[PDB]
Every structure is written in C-alpha cells, then in structure tokens.
Design a protein around this ligand. Sequence first.
Ligand SMILES: O[C@@H]1[C@@H](O)[C@H](O[C@@H]2CO[C@@H](O[C@@H]3CO[C@@H](O[C@@H]4CO[C@H](F)[C@H](O)[C@H]4O)[C@H](O)[C@H]3O)[C@H](O)[C@H]2O)OC[C@H]1O
Length: 330
Amino acid sequence: NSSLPSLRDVFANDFRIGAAVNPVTIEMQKQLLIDHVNSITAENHMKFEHLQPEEGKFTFQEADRIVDFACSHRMAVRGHTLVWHNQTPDWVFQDGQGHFVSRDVLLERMKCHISTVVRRYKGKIYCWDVINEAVADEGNELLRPSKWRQIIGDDFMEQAFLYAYEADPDALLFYNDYNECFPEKREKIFALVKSLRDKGIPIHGIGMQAHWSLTRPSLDEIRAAIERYASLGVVLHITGLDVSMFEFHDRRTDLAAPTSEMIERQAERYGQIFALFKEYRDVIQSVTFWGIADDHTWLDNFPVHGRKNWPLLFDEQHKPKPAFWRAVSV
Ligand SMILES: O[C@@H]1[C@@H](O)[C@H](O[C@@H]2CO[C@@H](O[C@@H]3CO[C@@H](O[C@@H]4CO[C@H](F)[C@H](O)[C@H]4O)[C@H](O)[C@H]3O)[C@H](O)[C@H]2O)OC[C@H]1O
C-alpha cells in the first residue's frame, strides 16, 4: 500500500521501469502500472497481425488505447515490433495466385507498413524494435530462416532499419532477441549488429529480452553479454524480463503453487540481476518486464500450454513478492 517503494522512483537514476500490457490488463492491473512503471510496451497489439491484418486494412484501435493510457500517465512507450518471423499474416508474402511475391514487392509492403505505423505514433513512441529474433537460436548459421529473408535476401534487415529511420529519424531503433546471453548466440548477435553499424545502418540499440530461468543464464554470462554488446557503442534495453520457475527441461503441468525454495531462489535471483543492472547503469537505459504481476503472464501457456507460472515481482493478488524486496534494495 502507501508505504511500498515505487519501482520507477527506486531506479530513477539508473533506468526506466516498464511493463508489457494490452487493453484488458491495463484495466485489470491499472494501479500497479500507475504506481510503479514509467514505460509501456504492447504485448501483442503492435505486431503486424494486429495492425494490418489485411492489405490496406489498418486496425489501430487497441494500440491507440495503450498509447493513450501511457501518455495520460507520463509513461514512455516502446514500439514492438515491425519485422518478425512470427505473428505476420500470410498476405504479406503472397500475390493473388498464392505464390510468393518478389524482392521489390515485399520491400514496398515492408516500407508501406513501417511508414504508416511509425508515422502515426511519431513523437509519442520513442523507440522501436525494428527487427525481432532474426538470428538463429540453434545450429551453425547466423540467421534464422523466414519469408522476409527468403524473399528479400539477407539485407532485408538493413532495409527495415532505413525505412524506420526515414519514417521517424528521432526514434531509437533496436535489434531485439532472446537467449541473448548464451555465448554462441551472443557472438552471432554481436557479429550481426557490428556488421550493420559498420555499414552505417541506423541501429541505435540492442534489446535484451531476458526470458530467464532461476539458473540460466549465469550472472557471468549476463555480465559478458552486457559488456560485449555495450562495446559496440549501442544503447541497451532489457525488453521482456521474466524469471520462470521452470527450467527448459522442466515441463511439469501439475504444480499448483511455487515451492518455498522456488520463491526464495527467485527472490535471490532477482536481487542478483538488478544488482548487475545497477552496476551497468551507464549502458542500460530501460528495464521492461513482460507483464507486471503473476495474474497475467504468457509463461502460463509457454512453453507448456495450460499450466501456471509465477515469474514477476507481484503475486496474483498484486502484493509484493519476496523478489520485490530484494530487487528494490540493491
Ligand atoms: O501472448 C504472447 C506474447 O506475450 C508473446 O510475446 C512474445 C514473447 O517473447 C518473445 O518471443 C519468444 C521469446 O522466447 C522464445 O522461446 C525460447 C525458446 O528457447 C529457450 F530455451 C527459451 O527458454 C525460450 O524463452 C519464443 O520462441 C519466442 O517466440 C517476443 O519478443 C514477444 O513478442 O508471444 C505471442 C503471444 O502468444
């Protein structure tokens, strides 16, 4: 209640504090957001499928509500996300006869979408995840396969950044990805961003999703990743932080509540993480959780459909967890 510290105040001098929302959860969690965050991200309603579900049909209504909420409460907004292998409708890659479109056609659709979306929120949204998760998560290759990449070629990302920059040259443009602290994938992300910067491409930041577990990645791997990326001269945002109660191999569905030890280790893990972020306050400018309280989290159904997870600083009744007290006292 009254005597609880406010996350954004606690970290006033370190970084912004954000949360991913939709219009429902804005209503359901309004007070937590008003009390703690100074930054908002749309969990789903600014991805391609929720902005242009059919060609020439733009559905900005839900995204507008999110932006209106943020502006009415002095909160910044991160835009998420323009170009991604997921949650993009099929029409984008097809012609009238069901076949794939050409390089030049896909570029015009990319440019048209990026221009329409970014111009609408120009001067309200201060940064954009332009490219999401383009690096390969496994294997020897640099890049994931995607229809973006297959149709256009490997320079589809340079084009995306240049289209966004032209639509709003005052925005900070980000490459955004997960498993960003595993060394092999860290070096791919580093190598990709380095090459883009070395060509003069307007990429200003790296977004570290940080969909983490109690164990992985280690504090040393997080520190190395921060330093490797920060050495490129880019801004760093932590963009989707949560601390899952299950490791990747742990696919149990029948846990009705977190254990005493899970709750305690999570508190400790969050304390170590925010200590590391504070230490690197000079390169980390924002820390956004993918949610805010345990009554809404995508981890309830990912990677295991139909279970429950407890990944955030507040519980389902919106009360501070022990993780809260450790996080604010670094
Ligand atoms: O409602 C959900 C919505 O919340 C969700 O948003 C995206 C979630 O995060 C990002 O996408 C996922 C990142 O994590 C990957 O999974 C990893 C698999 O490999 C590891 F082992 C690791 O432990 C996992 O974290 C997923 O494959 C990605 O899709 C995006 O940036 C968000 O937009 O997604 C859509 C809605 O259903």
